[PDB]
Amino acid sequence: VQSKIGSLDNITH
Amino acid sequence: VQSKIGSLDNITH
Amino acid sequence: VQSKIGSLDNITH
Amino acid sequence: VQSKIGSLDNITH
Amino acid sequence: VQSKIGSLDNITH
Amino acid sequence: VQSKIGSLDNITH
Amino acid sequence: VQSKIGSLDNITH
Amino acid sequence: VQSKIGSLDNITH
Amino acid sequence: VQSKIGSLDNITH
Amino acid sequence: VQSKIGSLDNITH
Amino acid sequence: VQSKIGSLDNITH
Amino acid sequence: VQSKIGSLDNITH
Amino acid sequence: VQSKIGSLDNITH
Amino acid sequence: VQSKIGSLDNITH
Amino acid sequence: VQSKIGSLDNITH
Amino acid sequence: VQSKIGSLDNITH
Amino acid sequence: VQSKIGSLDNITH
Amino acid sequence: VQSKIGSLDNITH
Amino acid sequence: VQSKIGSLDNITH
Amino acid sequence: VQSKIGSLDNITH
Amino acid sequence: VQSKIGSLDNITH
Amino acid sequence: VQSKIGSLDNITH
Amino acid sequence: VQSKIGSLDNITH
Amino acid sequence: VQSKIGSLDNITH
Amino acid sequence: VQSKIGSLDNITH
Amino acid sequence: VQSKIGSLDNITH
Amino acid sequence: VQSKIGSLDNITH
Amino acid sequence: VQSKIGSLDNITH
Amino acid sequence: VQSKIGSLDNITH
Amino acid sequence: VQSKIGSLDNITH
Amino acid sequence: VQSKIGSLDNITH
Amino acid sequence: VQSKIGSLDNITH
Amino acid sequence: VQSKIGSLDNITH
Amino acid sequence: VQSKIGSLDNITH
Amino acid sequence: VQSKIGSLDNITH
Amino acid sequence: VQSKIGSLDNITH
């Protein structure tokens, strides 16, 4: 597996 | 698997 | 699998 | 639940 | 649920 | 739960 | 106001 | 105001 | 005000 | 606003 | 705002 | 605001 | 038993 | 039993 | 038993 | 009131 | 009132 | 009041 | 309110 | 209110 | 309020 | 058995 | 048995 | 047995 | 969730 | 959920 | 959760 | 048994 | 048994 | 048994 | 991305 | 990215 | 990234 | 195999 | 194998 | 094997 992610936001308000 | 993702938002308001 | 995604929004208001 | 209220008056007279 | 209310008056007189 | 209230008056007279 | 009232309920949910 | 009241409830949830 | 009241409840949750 | 939700799932695979 | 939620899941795999 | 939540999970794998 | 009474008058004149 | 009464008058004149 | 009474008057004149 | 009564019963169950 | 009564019964069940 | 009564019963259960 | 109940079962299996 | 109930079962399996 | 209850079971298995 | 329940209420009034 | 419950209420009023 | 419960209330009023 | 199992065999050979 | 199973075999060979 | 199991075998061979 | 296997999963929920 | 296996999982929930 | 195994997991929850 | 591959062979002879 | 691969062989002979 | 691989062979002969 | 090749490319994306 | 090759590339992404 | 190679690359990402 080769992965590239810029930004990751997992948010609960 | 080769993946490229710019931005990922998983949000609950 | 070769994937390219610009922006991903998974949002619940 | 996402909520927005400007003004709220619960008044007994 | 996404809600927007300007003004709310619950008045007994 | 994300909430925003400007003003709230719970008044008995 | 100048009344005879058994039960008075002024409620906001 | 100038009344005869058994029970008075002014409630905001 | 100038009343006869059995029970008075002014509650904010 | 008066809201009741049994179950909520906001999921990204 | 009066809210009741049984269960909530905001998950990214 | 009056809120009741049974369970909450904000998880990133 | 779940009961709610506003006013009760048991009066003999 | 689930009961709600506004006013009750049991009066003998 | 769950009971709520505003006012009670048991009066003999 | 100004009467002749053998038995007087004013009962609320 | 100004009467002759043998038995008086005023009952609320 | 100004009467002749054998038994007077004013009861609230 | 006058109530008479023989047996009451509120059960979750 | 006059009530008479033999048996009451409120059950969830 | 007049109440009479034989047996009360509030059970969670 | 694989079970998922959001909310459960077993209530007697 | 594999079980998941958000919220549970077994209540008698 | 594998069990997960968010909240539990066994209440008698 | 109410469950009853007589026997269970999860076997790899 | 009320369930009854006599026998269960999950076997890989 | 109410559960009853007679026998359980999780065996790797 | 006498095999070439990449991944083996024998699962019971 | 007499095999070549990368990953073996025998799981009961 | 007489095998070459990378990871072996025999788990009961 | 949610992916599942049984077997992959990238072979140059 | 959520990925599952059984077997991978990148072989040059 | 969530990844699961059974077996990996990067071999040069 | 027994050949004359300038460039060899065996790629899996 | 028994060849004359300038460049050999065996790549898995 | 028994060859003449300028560059050999066997890569797993």
From Swiss-Prot, chains A, B, C, D, E, F, G, H, I, J, K, L, M, N, O, P, Q, R, S, T, U, V, W, X, Y, Z, AA, AB, AC, AD, AE, AF, AG, AH, AI, AJ:
Post-translational modification: Phosphorylation at serine and threonine residues in S-P or T-P motifs by proline-directed protein kinases (PDPK1, CDK1, CDK5, GSK3, MAPK) (only 2-3 sites per protein in interphase, seven-fold increase in mitosis, and in the form associated with paired helical filaments (PHF-tau)), and at serine residues in K-X-G-S motifs by MAP/microtubule affinity-regulating kinase (MARK1, MARK2, MARK3 or MARK4), causing detachment from microtubules, and their disassembly. Phosphorylation decreases with age.
Outcome (variant: residue 3 to L): In fatal respiratory hypoventilation; unusual apparent autosomal recessive inheritance; reduced binding to microtubules as well as increased fibrillization and aggregation
Domain of life: Eukaryota
Location within or outside the cell: Cytoplasm, Cytosol; Cell membrane; Cytoplasm, Cytoskeleton; Cell projection, Axon
Residues that bear Phosphoserine: 3, 7
Crosslink (Glycyl lysine isopeptide (Lys-Gly) (interchain with G-Cter in ubiquitin)) position: 4
Glycosylation sites: 4
Expression across tissues: Expressed in neurons. Isoform PNS-tau is expressed in the peripheral nervous system while the others are expressed in the central nervous system.
Record comment regarding domains: The tau/MAP repeat binds to tubulin. Type I isoforms contain 3 repeats while type II isoforms contain 4 repeats.
Quaternary structure and partners: Interacts with MARK1, MARK2, MARK3 and MARK4. Interacts with PSMC2 through SQSTM1. Interacts with SQSTM1 when polyubiquitinated. Interacts with FKBP4. Binds to CSNK1D. Interacts with SGK1. Interacts with PIN1. Interacts with LRRK2. Interacts with LRP1, leading to endocytosis; this interaction is reduced in the presence of LRPAP1/RAP.
Job description of the protein: Promotes microtubule assembly and stability, and might be involved in the establishment and maintenance of neuronal polarity. The C-terminus binds axonal microtubules while the N-terminus binds neural plasma membrane components, suggesting that tau functions as a linker protein between both. Axonal polarity is predetermined by TAU/MAPT localization (in the neuronal cell) in the domain of the cell body defined by the centrosome. The short isoforms allow plasticity of the cytoskeleton whereas the longer isoforms may preferentially play a role in its stabilization.
Disease named in the record: In Alzheimer disease, the neuronal cytoskeleton in the brain is progressively disrupted and replaced by tangles of paired helical filaments (PHF) and straight filaments, mainly composed of hyperphosphorylated forms of TAU (PHF-TAU or AD P-TAU). O-GlcNAcylation is greatly reduced in Alzheimer disease brain cerebral cortex leading to an increase in TAU/MAPT phosphorylations. Frontotemporal dementia 1: A form of dementia characterized by pathologic finding of frontotemporal lobar degeneration, presenile dementia with behavioral changes, deterioration of cognitive capacities and loss of memory. In some cases, parkinsonian symptoms are prominent. Neuropathological changes include frontotemporal atrophy often associated with atrophy of the basal ganglia, substantia nigra, amygdala. In most cases, protein tau deposits are found in glial cells and/or neurons.
Name recorded for this polypeptide: Microtubule-associated protein tau
Species the sequence originates in: Homo sapiens
Species classification: Eukaryota, Metazoa, Chordata, Craniata, Vertebrata
